Amino acid sequence: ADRASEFLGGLFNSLTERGRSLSQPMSGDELIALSETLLSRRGEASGVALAASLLAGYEAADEDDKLAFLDALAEQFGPDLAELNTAIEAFRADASAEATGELLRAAEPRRQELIRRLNHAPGGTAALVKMREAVLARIAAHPQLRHVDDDFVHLFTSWFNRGFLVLQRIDWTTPANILEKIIRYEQVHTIHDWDDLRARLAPPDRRCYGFFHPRLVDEPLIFVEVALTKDSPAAIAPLLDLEREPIAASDATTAVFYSISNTQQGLAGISFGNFLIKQVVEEIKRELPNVQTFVTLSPVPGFAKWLKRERDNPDSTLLDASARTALEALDTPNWFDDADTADRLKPIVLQLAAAYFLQAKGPNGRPLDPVARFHLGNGARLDRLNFLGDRSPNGMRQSHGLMVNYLYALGDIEANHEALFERGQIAAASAVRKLV
Template sequence: MNTSFFGELLQTISDRGRALLDRGRRSDTAAQSENLVELCEDLLSGRGEASGVARARDILSRYSELTTGPRIAFFEALAGRFGVQPERVSEAITAWQATPNDGTAARLHVASEPRRQELFRRLNLAPGGTAALVRMREQLMDVLPNRPDLQPVDEDFVHLFTSWFNRGFLVLRHIDWSTPANILEKIIRYEAVHEISDWDDLRRRIDPQDRRCYAFFHPALVDDPLIFVEVALTRDIPEAIAPILATEREPVEPEKARTAVFYSISNCQRGLAGVSFGNFLIKQVVEEICRELPKLSTLVTLSPAPTFAKWLKRERAQETSPAINEADRQAFAVLDEPGWWQDVDKLEELREPMMRAAAYYYLRAKTPRGMPVDPVARFHLGNGARLERLDWLADASDKGIAQSYGLMVNYLYNVEHIEKNHEAFAEQRTVVAASGVQRYLRPTLELVPIAG
């Protein structure tokens, strides 16, 4: 018997079978997305509100059942088939050029809008439509790194969400132990700065008399916070996070507190990235706390430095760096040793080089657009805060060591100077910083090589 012949025959049959199966899967993927696209066309062409709501509900229901392949095919249709219609734009431009008035301008505005924006508006009519669209954008964001051609769809989401989630619709709520459990569960899940380990940990953060938590909600996402901030009432400006999160500590009587510390701000809806809530939240919480406790004199953050370790590693890898000199480079070699932060002698040797590097990181290191490289700095400085103090080894948790070698910072919110600081940052990219931070930068000026 020619076993080789039968082996080749079986392999051929197997290959053809797989090819047919793959073709069937591709066909099924195309059919799923195409059916959904046709339903979207029907939704856009319809005029009845009741039928539109039912159709929108059906579309979102079917979309939720899509797997990755059909979902991407649907996004492709949103980018291509539901984009701008060139012929309508050309006609509107011609009309404007012939008769430039408010009417032709309005016609041009409507014609230049991608069809998918109106599609999203109609999908939003369905019960739970807003939440479904936020989840849809999350899934779109997952594929964007490999599909830049879908970026226009994402931009339309941000454009609409910015309107739908503007400050006028947001509701500030005080989160405490009496808040419904389903919301408290989400506070635990969404905490992005300092992990909440369990219900006892949550209670320590929101129940004591010297702790506060506030969150923004939207009427379309009734029990799902958009963003929340955790606040500690203290006597002085804290220089480390451990005492704030400590299991055993002596609570401060609110009437004796002179400082409110914003020590954690967490965005809850990834699908709303790019829609700013934090600046409104900080300002409203400041008003709320000052109204409740008029004796408070200092409003500060205790903020992480999420990209500091990555930046410093990059500077150390360069032969020459304006941020560190050779002596600093040798001192920083300790950072490659396991458990370096537990050695008191090593910490003392590291303090000055680390503070100089941190000052450069905040005051001089910039993105290509001239902004501070630290994302948290961009947020608080953009809100009008002042960089008040550098707190090295303020977060000795595994996460804190990994992302910043333990570095944290205090941003000061002085109500009288917020607008002035905001304008300086917005117009000149000025990093307003206390003299205590600036003094660490002066030695680094000697590090820049002088030609000749």
């Protein structure tokens, strides 16, 4: 039945209210010592006790002691090499069930149990996420921790099940402890104090939502900023216009997604499903059924640095001197001003930009642009390419000002998605694809 919606609501409410209810720096060595103790503990009370302790000791430790520990999760808490070999020989001797099971057992690094146990401490999950954040930041100077992050991903993928994710409008009636977080995760608009915030949430032509999961109480995991309007924008400058006149909800037909952000560093790479946006769309449709179309005014981070690599190679598959000439006009502080040099680049940029999307592919079989991977993964369609839609000194170096417009269509959202994942079809508008 559908009663499942109420049951989970009631349940997640007991969980959150419960959460809102509930020390001296340690060295890298002690932390390791403590881990071993926790891994051999049998009692459940002493277990959470050692766990909470370890987590407090780590949060308190000096940046150096922290790294000593993370490194140890690589060297001292991987699988037992002896056992694993024994187990390998057995399988090699007879590919039996007994042997194929002990192999699965012996190949599991001890870290997994350690993380599974640390997670029993009150606040454990939140601390664990902050820990994966530290290892993610340590991969560079210590590639070894890439395997330590692998195990966090495994476990996290299991905890943050997409079935328990939930969408909530983040308006002025939202709990203060949560909004206080929004002040921090706010990407676009500026917000220093609660006044800036209320003001930010005030306008009736502005909206924003958040996805919450019971594993992290009162934590908006994904933040979705929307703008209500009648026209489908091609420039960001206007939507963020502080002195412009805002309209009314019934006075809109096109909801435009100007910002979508993952708020927790430690959750990078953890999928929360691919029909997120679809949900944010229905919420808007249920509230304001007038809204006929749903488009996004997303950026294109990676295009500029793609135009670099693609130009630096004088043996481009489709980029001659005729182009490379006027092309490098971008190599000037201010070029977007000269209305002349502007209309010159438009055709050439939009032409290479179209390639960057439908043509360019990253490592694995998938679009190079990260924002494309997302919105496209979410069944949207690469509808329009707004040249110079963001002339901010930020976007100018990010994508040379180039901004695009993905369009979500309730009808064929799932359709595009299957296309993209099963085959490779990059749902794009005809007007953009004819720039090969």
